[PDB]
Write an enzyme that holds these catalytic residues in place. Structure first.
Site, PDB file in Angstrom:
ATOM      1  N   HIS A  55       0.817  -1.200   0.000  1.00  0.00           N
ATOM      2  CA  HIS A  55       0.000   0.000   0.000  1.00  0.00           C
ATOM      3  C   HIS A  55       0.862   1.266   0.000  1.00  0.00           C
ATOM      4  O   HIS A  55       0.340   2.372   0.135  1.00  0.00           O
ATOM      5  CB  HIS A  55      -1.076  -0.074   1.091  1.00  0.00           C
ATOM      6  CG  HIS A  55      -0.643   0.178   2.504  1.00  0.00           C
ATOM      7  ND1 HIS A  55      -0.761  -0.783   3.485  1.00  0.00           N
ATOM      8  CD2 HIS A  55      -0.202   1.284   3.127  1.00  0.00           C
ATOM      9  CE1 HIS A  55      -0.358  -0.279   4.641  1.00  0.00           C
ATOM     10  NE2 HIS A  55      -0.009   0.973   4.448  1.00  0.00           N
ATOM     11  N   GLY A 114       3.622   5.228  10.271  1.00  0.00           N
ATOM     12  CA  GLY A 114       5.032   5.111   9.941  1.00  0.00           C
ATOM     13  C   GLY A 114       5.606   3.762  10.371  1.00  0.00           C
ATOM     14  O   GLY A 114       6.628   3.335   9.836  1.00  0.00           O
ATOM     15  N   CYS A 173       4.245   1.194   9.635  1.00  0.00           N
ATOM     16  CA  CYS A 173       3.855   0.339   8.520  1.00  0.00           C
ATOM     17  C   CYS A 173       5.094  -0.361   7.956  1.00  0.00           C
ATOM     18  O   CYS A 173       6.084   0.303   7.643  1.00  0.00           O
ATOM     19  CB  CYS A 173       3.163   1.125   7.404  1.00  0.00           C
ATOM     20  SG  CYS A 173       1.524   1.802   7.805  1.00  0.00           S
TER      21      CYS A 173
HETATM   22  C1  LIG Z   1       0.464   2.422   9.081  1.00  0.00           C
HETATM   23  N1  LIG Z   1       1.232   1.946  10.010  1.00  0.00           N
HETATM   24  C2  LIG Z   1      -1.051   2.309   9.111  1.00  0.00           C
HETATM   25  C3  LIG Z   1      -1.530   1.457  10.288  1.00  0.00           C
HETATM   26  C4  LIG Z   1      -2.155   2.209  11.471  1.00  0.00           C
HETATM   27  C5  LIG Z   1      -2.418   3.708  11.393  1.00  0.00           C
HETATM   28  C6  LIG Z   1      -2.403   4.162  12.842  1.00  0.00           C
HETATM   29  N2  LIG Z   1      -1.592   3.141  13.497  1.00  0.00           N
HETATM   30  C7  LIG Z   1      -1.309   2.103  12.723  1.00  0.00           C
HETATM   31  O1  LIG Z   1      -0.491   1.197  12.982  1.00  0.00           O
HETATM   32  N3  LIG Z   1      -1.572   1.767   7.867  1.00  0.00           N
HETATM   33  C8  LIG Z   1      -2.759   2.164   7.392  1.00  0.00           C
HETATM   34  O2  LIG Z   1      -3.026   3.336   7.140  1.00  0.00           O
HETATM   35  C9  LIG Z   1      -3.829   1.084   7.349  1.00  0.00           C
HETATM   36  C10 LIG Z   1      -3.940   0.476   5.963  1.00  0.00           C
HETATM   37  C11 LIG Z   1      -5.349   0.755   5.461  1.00  0.00           C
HETATM   38  C12 LIG Z   1      -5.977   1.765   6.386  1.00  0.00           C
HETATM   39  N4  LIG Z   1      -5.193   1.554   7.607  1.00  0.00           N
HETATM   40  C13 LIG Z   1      -5.671   1.643   8.853  1.00  0.00           C
HETATM   41  O3  LIG Z   1      -4.960   1.337   9.800  1.00  0.00           O
HETATM   42  C14 LIG Z   1      -7.136   2.063   9.014  1.00  0.00           C
HETATM   43  N5  LIG Z   1      -7.926   0.861   9.238  1.00  0.00           N
HETATM   44  C15 LIG Z   1      -8.648   0.280   8.278  1.00  0.00           C
HETATM   45  O4  LIG Z   1      -8.879   0.778   7.196  1.00  0.00           O
HETATM   46  C16 LIG Z   1      -9.223  -1.104   8.594  1.00  0.00           C
HETATM   47  F1  LIG Z   1      -9.494  -1.797   7.497  1.00  0.00           F
HETATM   48  F2  LIG Z   1      -8.367  -1.827   9.302  1.00  0.00           F
HETATM   49  F3  LIG Z   1     -10.351  -1.027   9.291  1.00  0.00           F
HETATM   50  C17 LIG Z   1      -7.416   3.162  10.059  1.00  0.00           C
HETATM   51  C18 LIG Z   1      -8.795   3.762   9.773  1.00  0.00           C
HETATM   52  C19 LIG Z   1      -6.372   4.277   9.958  1.00  0.00           C
HETATM   53  C20 LIG Z   1      -7.402   2.629  11.494  1.00  0.00           C
HETATM   54  C21 LIG Z   1      -4.184   1.231   4.681  1.00  0.00           C
HETATM   55  C22 LIG Z   1      -4.011   2.727   4.553  1.00  0.00           C
HETATM   56  C23 LIG Z   1      -3.920   0.477   3.399  1.00  0.00           C
END
Ligand SMILES: *C(=N)[C@H](C[C@@H]1CCNC1=O)NC(=O)[C@@H]1[C@H]2[C@@H](CN1C(=O)[C@@H](NC(=O)C(F)(F)F)C(C)(C)C)C2(C)C
Ligand SMILES: *C(=N)[C@H](C[C@@H]1CCNC1=O)NC(=O)[C@@H]1[C@H]2[C@@H](CN1C(=O)[C@@H](NC(=O)C(F)(F)F)C(C)(C)C)C2(C)C
Lengths: 303, 303
Positions: free
Chosen positions: B41, B143, B145
């Site tokens: 992503h 971050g 991620c």
């Molecule tokens: C990057 N580390 C991040 C994960 C989390 C953001 C806050 N703390 C974290 O660890 N990655 C993302 O942004 C992650 C994946 C999908 C959206 N996303 C989320 O974490 C969201 N959750 C969802 O969409 C879910 F499907 F899990 F419900 C949210 C709303 C930020 C919690 C993508 C951007 C690909």
């Protein structure tokens, strides 16, 4: 949200872990530049441990009575100086892997990461806190002697702890890297009193601040309080009294939560008086007090 | 005695942590040999995240649209292959620091160490468990991620986890290193159900075995039980049913404690029915279920 106990990355410290043998006894040392540090009790047979005379013991020792292994590398020892309860050993090579470091003596309440070794090899890492009574409540088994604790400071490893001994109780004592014990302890196998522990109040607040930030907020009170008020409560429940300075350190959290310290001190007061009644805060069902305000801030921003 | 949650030493993994940028978005990757792995992503703007088409997105990308930083070192990307939800990037240099490794898909109940990074830099390490519902309850902020989880196998790093996304709930999902999610999740920002969690029964027993070994034994019952008996209890309290295989894995503990599994299963039954009534086991005041029997044995011998 979600929030666990978390330790600094250990790589930098793994590079300094050596085994040190001296007859029977063999434990872990820390090899920095061209010096190697370890608990002085390596020079004992388990018979001496009963009541050593570390000088008269040490006096019958020569560099050559000392085996220092780094994985499969040997270091010639070329000098040996006891400094309080730690032993120092001058060696031919300087550790290539020596990182930027200081030695520091930390304070009750302060946390650090600990790397637990067995015969000069890291088996595991955990985070822990120096208790108000200068003990720790970790997980150390024989051979873990000479394992170390440390904080990492972007680039810099501040070494604060070298592990020496367990207390009947299952709590640990050990020195700074100058070899002065933390606490009223000595490197001898005799009855030794831990002393009454207290709860690290500043941390507990820190923890609540962490809670609020993660969503957990059911415990947010309807009241407030003053300092004296709450301190005079704390006393009873064996909490450390809260200075102004503890408040100032918490302020960053005041700021991010927009919650005045004393409103939290007043949520605590109640929890203290009312118990927790089965529910959980951040999963835990008692009052975690081994995260500093600094700790919470590292993890509730993104360092 | 004394027993805490403890993570493998991370050094070996610290060597493989790189930052990967691709336009706006920038997250952590794992660079092994001459390949670099990360969540696919990275190729999204936060607008795409709403409902991506990873191929049509990826198709408009060339090696050169990809910045890969290792501290202050740059890697030319020379090849790019999406594999399920992970992205793979061929690079000029092979990581010097590549250790012995495998990739593995672990199973509900199994623990691992996790190294949390921010823009290709390790900030911290913690141990955790894959929940029965294929989520984890850790501590990941933006971050983080592309952070990874792993076990270490004397010399060998088995990589089991790459972190992708947080669920509204504050629990995490993520893939194996082949890029298949653990669980029924997808890399899209949409409502996604965690699913009902259960308690990892085998571990809980493991934990009790650890308790007994450390001195904590007040909960040792006056009774016994059979399997069906206890399973049919477990059901109610949302515990995973206990197979023979769970018993066999516990046997090593049976052995060291000389306590038949079912006598412990019968101490648990009561605790389950009677609650814990304010007292603590190994300090904790609820039932820890995130240490495996393997975990307890590592730490209650001396690996
Ligand atoms: C990057 N580390 C991040 C994960 C989390 C953001 C806050 N703390 C974290 O660890 N990655 C993302 O942004 C992650 C994946 C999908 C959206 N996303 C989320 O974490 C969201 N959750 C969802 O969409 C879910 F499907 F899990 F419900 C949210 C709303 C930020 C919690 C993508 C951007 C690909
Ligand atoms: C080596 N790691 C060991 C510490 C502990 C043994 C079991 N787990 C440990 O981490 N070092 C020692 O053997 C240590 C120091 C003193 C005895 N000793 C003890 O831990 C004992 N405790 C005491 O004597 C104390 F003063 F703390 F009460 C004991 C009885 C093994 C618990 C010396 C051998 C120098």
């Amino acid at each position: 949200s979600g929030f666990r106990k978390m330790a600094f990355p250990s790589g930098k410290v793994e590079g300094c872990m050596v085994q040190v043998t001296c007859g029977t006894t063999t434990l872990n040392g820390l090899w920095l530049d061209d010096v190697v540090y370890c608990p002085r009790h390596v020079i004992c047979t388990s018979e001496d441990m009963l009541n050593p005379n570390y000088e008269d013991l040490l006096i019958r020792k020569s560099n050559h009575n000392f085996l220092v292994q780094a994985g499969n590398v040997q270091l010639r020892v070329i000098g040996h100086s006891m400094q309080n309860c730690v032993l120092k050993l001058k060696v031919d090579t300087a550790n290539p892997k020596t990182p930027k470091y200081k030695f520091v003596r930390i304070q009750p309440g302060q946390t650090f990461s600990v790397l637990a070794c067995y015969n000069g090899s890291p088996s595991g890492v955990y985070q822990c806190a120096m208790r108000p009574n200068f003990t720790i409540k970790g997980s150390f088994l024989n051979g873990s002697c000479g394992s170390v604790g440390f904080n990492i400071d972007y680039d810099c490893v501040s070494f604060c702890y070298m592990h020496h001994m367990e207390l009947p109780t299952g709590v640990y004592a050990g020195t700074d890297l100058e070899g002065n014990f933390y606490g009223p302890f000595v490197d001898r196998q005799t009855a030794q009193a831990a002393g009454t522990d207290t709860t690290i109040t500043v941390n507990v607040l820190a923890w609540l601040y962490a809670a609020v930030i993660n969503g957990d907020r059911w415990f947010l009170n309807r009241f407030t309080t003053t300092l004296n008020d709450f301190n005079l409560v704390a006393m009873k429940y064996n909490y450390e009294p809260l200075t102004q300075d503890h408040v100032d350190i918490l302020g960053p959290l005041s700021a991010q939560t927009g919650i005045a310290v004393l409103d939290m001190c007043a949520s605590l007061k109640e929890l203290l008086q009312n118990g927790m009644n089965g529910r959980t805060i951040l999963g835990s069902a008692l009052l975690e007090d081994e995260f500093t305000p600094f700790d919470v801030v590292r993890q509730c921003s993104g360092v």
